[PDB]
Amino acid sequence: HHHGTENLYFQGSAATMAAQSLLSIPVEYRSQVWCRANLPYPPAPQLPIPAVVDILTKASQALPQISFSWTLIDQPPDGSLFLVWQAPTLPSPPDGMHFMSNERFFNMDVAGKVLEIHEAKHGFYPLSETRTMHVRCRYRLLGVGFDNFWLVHYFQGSETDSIPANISVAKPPHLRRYPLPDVKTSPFLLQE
Ligand SMILES: [Cl-]
Ligand SMILES: [Cl-]
Ligand SMILES: [Cl-]
Ligand SMILES: [Cl-]
């Protein structure tokens, strides 16, 4: 009466390792962790669309040799790129960023496949910023057997996009609890 949707995504025998690792985390932090690949990606400025498609395509081909950990992500620096496992019908865990506007959802046709682009401009870190300075993009490429994997990218906003920021009217509306617990799991696989 609480976890039906999550349970659908943990049916795989390789998703058994992910499930076992999540159950090792205190219940209160299970909703707070990202399932993030142990790469790490080199940081990058805003990526051209063909680069996004190649990065997700290569990740999908390398998946059996890439491990994941449940981890907290908080106030990642500009340039940060992550490969994450996430159900599209579940909310993203927190990253410490708040937004003065709604995330916009665009779809592109790429070589006959759909690339989803979830672009959240007007990002800010309320503990340290009074104006917006950051963009977060979440990408996924559909119909190539990698539907629940995302590229998540944080980068610097343009000066002209910067607007005054106030947590009282931002999304999400609540500041996360600091300091963060240490909760990073040992690595596991999502395909064998
Ligand atoms: Cl475990
Ligand atoms: Cl808006
Ligand atoms: Cl998938
Ligand atoms: Cl929200």
Residue numbers in the entry: -11 to 180
Question: How is this structure described in the published paper?
Answer:
The Ssr4 sequence has little homology to other sequences in the Protein Data Bank, so the structure was solved using an iodine derivative with SAD phasing. As there were no homologous structures in the PDB which might serve as a molecular-replacement model for this protein structure, we attempted to use several different methods for de novo phasing: xenon, bromine and iodine soaks and native sulfur SAD phasing. The Ssr4 structure was solved using a crystal that had been soaked with iodine and which showed two major peaks for I atoms in the electron density (about 40σ and 30σ above the background), with three more peaks (12σ, 11σ and 5.5σ) that corresponded to either low-occupancy I or Cl atoms (some of these peaks are also seen in non-iodine-soaked structures). Auto-Rickshaw was used to find the iodines, phase the data and build the initial structure via Buccaneer. Although the sulfur, bromine and iodine data sets all showed some anomalous signal in the scaled statistics, only the iodine data set had sufficient signal to solve the structure. Density was seen for residues extending from the N-terminal tag to residue 179/180 of the Ssr4 protein in all three structures. The N-terminal tag used for purification forms a helix from residues −9 to −2 and there is a break in the density in two of the three structures where the residues Ser1 and Ala2 should reside (Ser1 is the last residue of the tag and Ala2 is the first residue of native Ssr4). These two residues were modelled into one of the models as there is some weak density in the iodine-phased data, with a break at Gly0. We have crystallized and solved the structure of the N-terminal domain (up to residue ∼180 of 395) of Ssr4 using an iodine derivative.
Ssr4 is a yeast protein from Schizosaccharomyces pombe and is an essential part of the chromatin-remodelling [SWI/SNF and RSC (remodelling the structure of chromatin)] complexes found in S. pombe. These complexes (or their homologues) regulate gene expression in eukaryotic organisms, affecting a large number of genes both positively and negatively. The chromatin structure is altered by modifying the DNA–histone contacts, thus opening up or closing down sections of DNA to specific transcription factors that regulate the transcription of genes. The structure of the N-terminal domain is an antiparallel β-sheet of seven strands with α-helices on one side and random coil on the other.
